[PDB]
Amino acid sequence: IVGGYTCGANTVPYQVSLNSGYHFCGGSLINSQWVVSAAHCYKSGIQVRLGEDNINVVEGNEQFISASKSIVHPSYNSNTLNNDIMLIKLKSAASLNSRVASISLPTSCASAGTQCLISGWGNTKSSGTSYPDVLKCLKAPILSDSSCKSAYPGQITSNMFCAGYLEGGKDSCQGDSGGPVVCSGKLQGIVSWGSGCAQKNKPGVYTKVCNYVSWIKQTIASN
Ligand SMILES: CC(=O)N1CCN(C(=O)[C@H](Cc2cccc(C(=N)N)c2)NS(=O)(=O)c2ccc3ccccc3c2)CC1
Numbered sequence: 001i002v003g004g005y006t007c008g009a010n011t012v013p014y015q016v017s018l019n020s021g022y023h024f025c026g027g028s029l030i031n032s033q034w035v036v037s038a039a040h041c042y043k044s045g046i047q048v049r050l051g052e053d054n055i056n057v058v059e060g061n062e063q064f065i066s067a068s069k070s071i072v073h074p075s076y077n078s079n080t081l082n083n084d085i086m087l088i089k090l091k092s093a094a095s096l097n098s099r100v101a102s103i104s105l106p107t108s109c110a111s112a113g114t115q116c117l118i119s120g121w122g123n124t125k126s127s128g129t130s131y132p133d134v135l136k137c138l139k140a141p142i143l144s145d146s147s148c149k150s151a152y153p154g155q156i157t158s159n160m161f162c163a164g165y166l167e168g169g170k171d172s173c174q175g176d177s178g179g180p181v182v183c184s185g186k187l188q189g190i191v192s193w194g195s196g197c198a199q200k201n202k203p204g205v206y207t208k209v210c211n212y213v214s215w216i217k218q219t220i221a222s223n
């Protein structure tokens with residue numbers, strides 16, 4: 001997260017860290033046994049880390065559970081990043097409490113202007129590489145589809161939305177991928193892509209979760 005702030009230990013209880021000997025992506029706990037992330041984060045040998053703040057120290061409240069299966073959306077395109085969504089089933093159910101809780105799926109799409117909270121352990125520098133120990137947060141509004149498409153001509157599909165600041169300096173970045181974009185207590189987006197990080201007139205593009213609610217539910221019901 002570039003231009004964000006330290007969230008505070010366990011203030012984003014649904015935030016998940018995808019680990020394979022190091023943190024590579026974020027995710028969101030949608031129920032005791034299912035995590036939603038980005039398809040481009042797919043990797044074998046995934047350990048899901050719940051209740052995390054400092055990802056390098058065992059401080060208490062953590063829960064490490066192996067992923068039993070990772071379901072990448074069947075129509076995911078690695079070139080366009082369209083349908084950039086993946087579901088992860090936990091080997092065991094997570095112990096829900098005050099510091100580990102699930103986030104609600106949207107019942108409707110969010111409109112332009114809505115302020116959302118984006119979080120993660122990704123890169124914090126626009127020009128360079130710096131990874132934090134603790135979780136960073138960023139509040140950013142959803143932009144208009146016209147603006148989004150003016151920024152990324154021919155690359156924005158109906159399953160994506162832009163969020164952030166056109167002036168630059170505040171945006172999600174590498175390592176944040178798969179993480180949550182929560183608006184009004186509902187998971188509206190998943191950190192997907194963007195041209196660089198925090199660049200002028202290049203906001204972040206996120207997977208439009210409201211278009212996948214039925215898919216998620218059906219897929220979960222059948223697995
Ligand atoms: C591995 C992976 O899928 N990806 C896709 C997602 N990737 C990126 O978007 C990267 C870094 C990144 C990651 C997450 C959010 C942002 C943001 N600006 N909000 C930027 N930005 S980039 O300019 O290097 C970039 C942009 C679009 C891309 C589209 C396809 C492939 C690579 C791409 C790289 C990481 C590699």
Ligand SMILES: [Ca+2]
Binds near residue numbers: 052053054055056058
């Ligand atoms: Ca820790």
